Every structure is written in C-alpha cells, then in structure tokens.
C-alpha cells in the first residue's frame, strides 16, 4: 500500500492496467500486448489534448503520455477508485450521491467531447471498429465466429437491435471525436471525475461512446441484480448528455445507440465463449442481458421504435 507500489491491477484481453501509489496521488499506467498503429501515438494524443484543452471537457480528460509504443502513463488522480467499483458492487453498500452524480457529469462530458470540430483533430483516425480489434484482426475474426455460433434464440431482441434494427438508421450523420473505450472502469468517480484511457480515441459515431458506457450497466444488472440502480444510472447519463447538448436524442440516434449496445453485448458474450472455451456460460450471460436490456434502454429514454424490437 506504500508509495511507489501497485495498489490495483486490472488485466484484460486487450489492455493491462495498473494503479501505482505515488507521493502526489495515484498514477495509472496501461500497456497493450502489441505495438500497433491502431493505438493513438504521441502526436495524436497531443493533438487531442490540444483540442480538448480550451473546452469544458478539459477538466475531466486525464490523457496519458507514452513511455513507449505499448505503454501509457497518466496524470495523477486523487483516488485509486473507479466507477466500475460501484457499478459492479456485490453485495450492496450505501448509495453515495456524489458517486451516482458521476453519470450525469459523464453524460455532459461526452456531449462536450462530441462537439469538438473535426478540423481541430486532424491526427485522429476514423474508427471503423474498436482499436483493439483493428490491432488484432485474428481476435476479431475469432470473436465474430464465436458470435455466429451463439444460439439465435437466446436473445432475439438483442439480435434484432444489433442486426436489422441497426441498419434502419441513416448512414449520413455527423461523426465526432469519440473516446472509444468509455467503460466505467475507465472513469474515476466524482466529485471531480476523471476519464482515463484515450489510446482508442478517434472519429466515429458519438452514440457508440454512450453505448459502451451503458454496456457496463447492462452487464452488472444481469450479473449482480441491482436492476433499478443501473436503470437510474442510465437515466442520469442521458439527462446529462441531453442537457449539455441542448437537444434530445433523435429516433435515429437511439436506433444507432441500441445497435452499438446490443452488438457490444454480443461481442462480450462471444468473447467469454471464445476466450474461455465456455459456450454454455456465455449463453447464460446472453439470456440475462436480454432480460436487463429493455429496462436500461427505457430509462435512457429510448422510444418504442427501439424498445418495440425487444
């Protein structure tokens, strides 16, 4: 627990993360297993920081420097806690209002991030798929194969949202800066919340950032059962995003959001089936996500046009 020593380790399929206690606070580092151009280099991270710096998103953005092509080090934060510690908490503990308010602040932060003009971010790549899948095309194909082997009757509403439903939205809409990996494990909770990561950032659909954040609410509702708490967090996120932007999400935006969220759930369960040779456990996860998703999308404000697909 001493200064200079690791207090948290978060391994993952695509990125390893460590929180080192230091004299001035808590220092997050991340490594990726391959040096790949899909991950933002030093110049792209600088360009993005420069674009964020004069905006109201600056306070939240904890953008790292690179030690090497595979290794990032973040500005110090004041706690080793992560929003995911609350979202996936089991058993329940007392609701901390300032932690819950992080969701409204994140929605506002994302609205501001998504308003940065593309001309200010010339170094950022168009994200046609997540950075981690572009860096590892063999993993992408394997996950896609495992996803194809999922029982199509396990989650028919999720399948509709990810497939036919997603395709109904127009393809022409403003692409924006996206964080690209906005899971609750990349957020330091409020007061004064901070957003970590950034090497997956680029230019893509802003709805994909909101979907990625909502996926943790669906997964935790399904796995731990605090459905009402997760629904309230979803509602707060939408409230903050719409208030900051000044306009409600359109039906098309909700269709795209639900498609990214449903696809993300399928990717998550397919990864469990393929990473851990567990087709039957992934099926159980998928059936629970099918039951948890409608309430979360409803709380987020999705219309019957979306929620009609189940």
């Amino acid at each position: 627990v001493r200064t200079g020593q690791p207090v948290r380790s978060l391994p993952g399929p695509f990125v390893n993360r460590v929180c080192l206690r230091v004299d001035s606070g808590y220092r997050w580092g991340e490594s990726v297993p391959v040096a790949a151009p899909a991950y933002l280099d030093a110049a792209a991270l600088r360009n993005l920081a420069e674009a964020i710096a004069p905006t109201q998103a600056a306070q939240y953005a904890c953008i790292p420097a690179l030690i090497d092509d595979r290794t990032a080090i973040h500005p110090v934060v004041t706690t080793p806690r992560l929003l995911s510690d609350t979202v996936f908490e089991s058993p329940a503990s007392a609701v901390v209002p300032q932690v819950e308010q992080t969701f409204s602040e994140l929605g506002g932060f994302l609205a501001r991030l998504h308003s940065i003009p593309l001309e200010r971010v010339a170094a950022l790549p168009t994200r046609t798929r997540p950075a981690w899948l572009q860096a590892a095309p063999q993993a992408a194909d394997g996950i896609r194969a495992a996803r194809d082997r999922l029982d199509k009757d396990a989650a028919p509403g999720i399948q509709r949202l990810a497939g036919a439903g997603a395709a109904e939205a127009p393809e022409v809409f403003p692409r924006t800066v996206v964080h690209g990996r906005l899971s609750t494990a990349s957020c330091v909770p409020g007061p004064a919340p901070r957003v970590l990561g950034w090497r997956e950032a680029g230019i893509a659909d802003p709805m994909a950032d909101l979907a990625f954040l909502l996926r943790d609410l669906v997964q935790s509702a399904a796995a731990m059962g605090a459905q009402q708490l997760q629904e309230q967090r979803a509602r707060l996120t939408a409230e903050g995003y719409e208030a900051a932007r000044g306009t409600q999400l359109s039906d098309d935006e909700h269709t795209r959001l639900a498609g990214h969220l449903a696809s993300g759930i399928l990717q998550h369960v397919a990864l469990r089936a393929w990473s851990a040779s567990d087709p039957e456990g992934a099926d159980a996860l998928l059936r629970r996500a099918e039951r948890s998703l409608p309430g979360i999308l409803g709380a987020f404000g999705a219309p019957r046009e979306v929620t009609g697909r189940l």
Binding site: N16, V18, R27, A65, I67, I73
Partner: protein, 39 residues
C-alpha cells in the same frame, strides 16, 4: 497456450508494466512532472 503458460505471460506482462511506471515516476524531472501533472 496452457494455463501455466497463460499465467506466466500475464505475470510477466503485469510486472513489466509496474516496473515501467515505477521507472518513469522515479526518473521524471520536475519539468516533465509539470507537463503531465499540472496544478
């Protein structure tokens, strides 16, 4: 990779990241510290 191999890889990758962050923290100068951690 077997389970023993996967665990060996994960242990090595984690320790290497810890060592890199420790090295960077130890050696960063006040001017580099000023750019990454502003007040």
């Amino acid at each position: 990779m077997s389970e023993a191999m996967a665990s060996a890889v994960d242990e090595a990758a984690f320790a290497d990241l810890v060592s890199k962050i420790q090295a960077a923290e130890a050696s960063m100068t006040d001017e580099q510290r000023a750019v990454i951690d502003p007040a």
